[PDB]
């Protein structure tokens, strides 16, 4: 009955408990202790981008690395030329309070999303000369928190209604629906073979997910409070979490347990965005103390502080090529860091 | 510098200026976060006042622009995401009083709703709606019969009205930083937006004494 | 997209004539324009240019001064207004669309045109030959010189490759030396050293004749070439 599969569960849980503890032969720390510290790091603001006129909650870069898209809670999408600091396009959305935006890799289309639990797609290249929208999806029960393209037809969503969605953007109807969370999710991210696909849902549990199947494969669990932030690294077996229990967090999908802590004394307050680097070794984090901070991912300690922004900065992005860092805070300005 | 970034530096003036056209218009805006129920008639309400997911509205008041948001029923989102409103200056609390049974129900949620640290620095406007009811059901129906706190005589109407904006009241821990207000409206229907303004400039008028109180 | 021009004929030595273009299909509003010149039976050359937002003008250095260029965003026309009109001014006017922002293809659609009848710094291009006998199936190359070099500090290069069949309008082949505009079969390419440069067929076919130009764009003015006759 009920109790048979309750103790079964719990046998179960028993067995993968074990697992995990049986392959825990050495720590992080202990391997990477011959390795040489990063020293210090000095970022200085090349160029300060102006025009918003209300907070920045997302912005995303491009395939070339040259041009970007950024959108704040007055309505308004800017792709900026960041070479020469030009506007190259204004886009006026529908809806005010908007909380994701994305970038094709093909450069012709854009999406954005939020409380309107719809999710719109733009196109860029027409023939009359604007930029009009495309389409519409709709089919949520909760707001939407990150949307990312995959192809230039298919489309994945997140929202708060604890399920995802993987969407054919010709057709216009869901193909596959994630479900499995107790919680409302925050945040997601695509690994480089874009075959599978990473999300966390403020349940101090992280789950990895299949495409061609629809089955989630594995979960993890260890943090205290929702999770804000998710991040992929290069090779597409590895993530790190952030939490409002100011603890960041890396798992690696093949160990099937947790492997770095960040955390320090002096810090109380959580974590808006993370991102990575290049070669994997600067893992950049924004907090709610008006700054952002640059760890050394093998090391977990203190490498750098970007402390420009007179707001919580809730937005942060990473170059294609490596040559670039963007920030976004609550005080309407983006800089870019080199 | 090239014959064609020229042209490009153009159009980035053009759309710079396109863009600073709005300033002048934001930075002169009010926003109020309107909270109802079902049966609460909010629909009437804000057909009433002239105007006109998630529904906004925009209308102006003696030269002074004003942007309402109506939340349809999403209360139940219980976490700080939820929690974007922090730019307003007011929230409408529009609550029933002739359905008895349904009394405490509204109470669950305002001390919910009133309680977060957000809006430690922001005022509530209570309406008790259409408040007429009452008046021919207070001597049909003991109001003793769903409450025992109560003292005064079922029928006079003044002792109910008093005991209803006191349980409302004593709701606020720590009650008040800025002041919680309270009206009588049934079918008025062309007075609200005068006293909707009126505690709006009370409490804008709280927080600038505030600021030139710096000793 | 569509252009249509209008306000040509037959005048006398003295006098003034106006012309006028008209849009239709796109946002006339974010474009500018270009108005150019053909001689009867010899190449083409620039007259005017205006721009969105009314910032900049340019005229030629044959005729300013007699010439003046307008436009009027909510109607959707464009003006040109000539005066003092002499026997070297016999022609027949084009109107051309070009936007410049980052990863524009300017030069893209062209009008049909009108005629008109009366009774040291500029880079100077010479066109390599006037007739090529060639046969479907083959290959071809054309090419052309310039004065000074065309690639500017930031990576580019600015020359351009237009095609004009016969009794048709100039249609865009290759912007900015390297790329292919949109609706043209991807048989084309193009290339060239410094200051010497080549368009490229391959497969030569029917309705692929016609005369070829090549125009530069680095700095005001623009000059164009002989042009070079193919004939199959």
């Known amino acids: 009955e009920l109790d048979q599969l309750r103790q079964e569960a719990e046998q179960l849980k028993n067995q993968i408990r074990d697992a995990r503890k049986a392959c825990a032969d050495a720590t992080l720390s202990q391997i990477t202790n011959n390795i040489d510290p990063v020293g210090r790091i000095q970022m200085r603001t090349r160029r300060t981008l102006r025009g918003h006129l209300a907070k920045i909650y997302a912005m995303h870069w491009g395939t070339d690395s040259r041009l970007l898209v950024s959108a704040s809670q007055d309505g308004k999408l800017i792709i900026w030329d960041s070479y020469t600091t030009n506007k190259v396009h204004a886009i006026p959305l529908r809806s005010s309070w908007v909380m994701t935006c994305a970038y094709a890799p093909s450069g012709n289309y854009v999406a954005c999303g939020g409380l309107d639990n719809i999710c719109s797609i733009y196109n860029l290249k027409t023939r009359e000369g604007n930029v009009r929208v495309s389409r519409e999806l709709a089919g949520h029960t909760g707001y939407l928190s990150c949307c990312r393209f995959l192809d230039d037809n298919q489309i994945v969503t997140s929202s708060g209604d604890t399920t995802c969605a993987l969407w054919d953007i010709e057709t216009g109807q869901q193909t596959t629906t994630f479900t499995g969370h107790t919680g409302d999710v925050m945040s997601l991210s695509l690994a480089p073979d874009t075959r599978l696909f990473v999300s966390g849902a403020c349940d101090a549990s992280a789950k990895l997910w299949d495409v061609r199947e629809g089955m989630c494969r594995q979960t993890f669990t260890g943090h205290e409070s929702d999770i804000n932030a998710i991040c992929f690294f290069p090779n597409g077996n590895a993530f790190a979490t952030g939490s409002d229990d100011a603890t960041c967090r890396l798992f690696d999908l093949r160990a099937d347990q947790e492997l770095m802590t960040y955390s320090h004394d002096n810090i109380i307050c959580g974590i808006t965005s993370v991102s990575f680097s290049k070669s994997g070794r600067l893992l950049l984090a924004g907090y709610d103390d008006f700054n952002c901070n640059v760890w050394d991912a093998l090391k977990a300690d203190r490498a750098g502080v970007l402390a420009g922004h007179d707001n919580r900065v809730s937005c942060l992005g990473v170059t294609d090529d490596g040559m670039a860092v963007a920030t976004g805070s609550w005080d309407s300005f983006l800089k870019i860091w080199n | 510098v090239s014959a064609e970034d020229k042209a490009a530096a153009e159009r980035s003036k053009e759309i710079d200026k396109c863009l600073s056209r709005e300033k002048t218009y934001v930075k002169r805006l009010v926003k109020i976060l309107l909270l109802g129920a079902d049966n609460s008639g909010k629909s009437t309400f804000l057909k009433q006042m002239r105007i006109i997911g998630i529904h906004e509205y925009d209308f102006e008041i003696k030269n002074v622009p004003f942007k309402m948001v109506d939340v349809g029923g999403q209360r139940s989102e219980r976490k700080r995401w939820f929690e974007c409103f922090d730019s307003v200056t007011s929230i409408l609390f529009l609550v029933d009083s002739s359905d008895f049974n349904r009394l405490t129900e509204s109470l669950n949620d305002f001390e919910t709703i009133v309680n977060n640290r957000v809006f430690s620095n922001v005022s509530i406007i209570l309406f008790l709606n259409k408040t007429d009811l009452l008046e021919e059901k207070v001597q049909i129906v003991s109001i003793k019969d769903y409450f025992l706190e109560f003292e005064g005589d079922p029928h006079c109407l003044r002792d109910v009205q008093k005991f209803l904006v006191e349980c409302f009241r004593n709701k606020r821990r720590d009650q008040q930083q800025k002041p919680l207000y309270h009206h009588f409206t049934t079918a008025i229907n062309t007075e609200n937006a005068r006293l909707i303004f009126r505690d709006v400039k009370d409490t804008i008028l709280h927080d600038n004494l505030k600021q030139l109180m710096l000793q | 997209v569509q252009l249509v021009e209008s306000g040509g004929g037959l005048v006398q030595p003295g006098g003034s004539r106006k012309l006028s273009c008209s849009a239709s299909?796109?946002?006339?509003?974010?474009?500018?324009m270009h108005w150019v010149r053909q001689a009867p039976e010899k190449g083409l050359e620039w007259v005017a240019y205006?721009?969105?937002?009314?910032?900049?003008?340019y005229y030629a250095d044959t005729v300013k001064g007699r010439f003046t260029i307008s436009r009027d965003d909510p109607k959707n026309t464009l003006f040109l207004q000539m005066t003092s009109l002499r026997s070297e001014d016999t022609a027949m006017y084009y109107c051309?669309?070009?936007?410049?922002?980052?990863?524009?293809?300017?030069?893209?659609?062209w009008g049909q045109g009108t005629t008109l009848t009366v009774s040291s710094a500029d880079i100077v291009m010479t066109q390599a030959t006037s007739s090529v006998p060639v046969t479907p199936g083959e290959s071809v190359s054309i090419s052309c010189r310039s004065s000074?070099?065309?690639?500017?500090?930031?990576?580019?290069?600015?020359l351009y490759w237009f095609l004009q069949r016969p009794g048709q309008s100039p249609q865009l082949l290759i912007y900015?030396?390297?790329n292919l505009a949109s609706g043209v079969p991807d048989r084309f390419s193009g290339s060239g050293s410094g200051t010497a440069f080549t368009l490229t067929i391959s497969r030569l076919e029917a309705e692929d004749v016609g005369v070829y130009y090549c125009?530069?764009?680095?700095?005001?003015?623009?000059?164009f070439g002989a042009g070079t006759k193919l004939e199959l």
């Open positions: 051309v669309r070009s936007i410049y922002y980052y990863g524009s293809s300017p030069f893209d659609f």
């Open positions: 299909g796109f946002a006339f509003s974010s474009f500018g």
């Open positions: 205006i721009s969105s937002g009314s910032g900049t003008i």
């Open positions: 000074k070099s065309l690639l500017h500090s930031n990576g580019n290069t600015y």
């Open positions: 900015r030396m390297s």
């Open positions: 125009m530069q764009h680095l700095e005001y003015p623009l000059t």
